[PDB]
Structures are given as C-alpha cells and as structure tokens.
Amino acid sequence: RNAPFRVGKKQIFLPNHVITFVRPLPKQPPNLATFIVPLEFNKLDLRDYLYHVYNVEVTGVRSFVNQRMHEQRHGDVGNWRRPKSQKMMIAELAKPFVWPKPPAEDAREAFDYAMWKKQKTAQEQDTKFQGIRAQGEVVPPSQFEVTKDRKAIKARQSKFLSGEETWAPGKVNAFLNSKI
Amino acid sequence: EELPPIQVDENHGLWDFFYDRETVAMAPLEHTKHGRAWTVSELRKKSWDDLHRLWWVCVKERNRIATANWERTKSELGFGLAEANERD
C-alpha cells in the first residue's frame, strides 16, 4: 500500500459526488481522460478519487470551468438568472485508455433508434418552423410538404378524370333520419 | 482513423464507468432489469463495514449511470433516459 502521490489527512467516508466519464475529442491522445466533476472539486481530489476508488494512476490533472447561458426562471417569463457552472477535468493517465466507437446507425435497434429518429425530426421541424415565425415570416403554401391526405386526393382526381370510377354523393356527411 | 489500435489493459480502472465495453450505455430493455431500493428496516441489520462498502457500490453505480446518460445523448444512440432515472 503505497500511493504514487502524497495523500491528505482529511478522510471522506461517504462522498456524495457524481463523476461522469466523457468521451475524448477526436485528435486527443489516448492518455487523456476527461471527467465532469462538481464545481467544488479540485485537482488534488480527482487524483485521490481516481486511485482509491478506481485504482487509476495519473501523472497530471487539468481543469476548466464551463459557464451556462443566463436564462429566465420560467422559460420566457420570470427574472433573469444564471445556472451553476460546469467543471471538467482532464487526467494524464499513466496507462492509455481507448474508447469504443459508436455503433452504426443501423445497429442501434436495441435503443429503439428508428422511433427516436422519427421523433427527433418532428422536434427538429417544430423548432425550425418556430424560428421562421420568430423572423416574422411564414411558409408559403407552395413549399408545404404534401401530407398523406393530399397524396390520396391526387390519385382520386386521376381516377375520376380518367373514367375508372364514377362519382356519387356522399353518404356519411351526416346521419339524418330522412335519408334524402 | 486507420492506425493500428493500441492494446488497452483488460483490468483497467476506467472500465468500471462502462456498462458494456462495446456500447458505454446499456440497452433500455436490460437497464430496467433491477430490483428495488433497500428499506431502512433491512439496513438496520448491517454493520458499518457492510454499510460502508454498500455506499461505495451505490456511488460507483451512479457514476456508471451518469456515464451512460452523457454518451447516449452525444452519440444519438436512442431512448433510455427514462429508465436510467428510475434506476438512479
């Protein structure tokens, strides 16, 4: 039992912090490990937290704070405030570590990627249409995407005009007792 | 992106943040296959050594969940955030 560094004297038996291990950047070497730590965390803590809990030796630590956009308390209403910032730490591991590559879009069926992508597009088009209204504009009728209801009325039009089907008065417009 | 990959030690300390070594996150269908939280009545029969070791099993379990949440969003893996909240 001999740590590579000098250990402190204040013992923490029940730490409540949550450490997140984030994927590195594309061009970063394989000896850098980035983590999300509490704002009160310091370099000395991560070095001691990564060795006593995970048995990971680090030769150096880097830390930087990421701010958060100022916001209103309730969406677009309320006073103007600023959330608590985020602290990220990069450890220079003594042993390299390489992450796995994300699965292919077609191999994400365990996460229900098919349904998730459909929902994402819907929300992607909702925030894009709301941005067109925030500029003081609207989508002209000619650019609206034709829905399934408009694709069905164009096939009926070709069937009536051609002569395949014969038009007849509606029978479900209203349920009258007269039936005339 | 076409370099020979390095050999990462099998027993690396940072492998404890991952649920599956191929996909950091766990499948939502297998992420909910868990029990319930310990009741205070059941913990009164555990010594300090059992409650001190169990606390750190929960800490490392939350660090493992926070790691799967951050990856799922960035990698656009899919759903699973609603199941990690109940497990957490």
Binding site: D112 | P28, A82, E83
Partner: peptide, 29 residues
C-alpha cells in the same frame, strides 16, 4: 399520444402502444 410525452416514457409503455396499433390493423382486414 403527444409529441412530448412519447420520449419521456419507457420502452415498455412505448411498445405497448404499438401492440395496440398492431392489433388494430388485424381487425381491419
């Protein structure tokens, strides 16, 4: 089924709404 209450649920409930629509199509044939 709203557009924002569809991703806040589990896959167990999201798949329970597909069985509803699946069995709803077998009755139309």
């Amino acid at each position: 089924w709203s557009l924002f209450g569809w991703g806040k649920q589990k896959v167990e409930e999201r798949n329970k709404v597909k069985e509803e629509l699946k069995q709803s199509e077998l009755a139309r044939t």
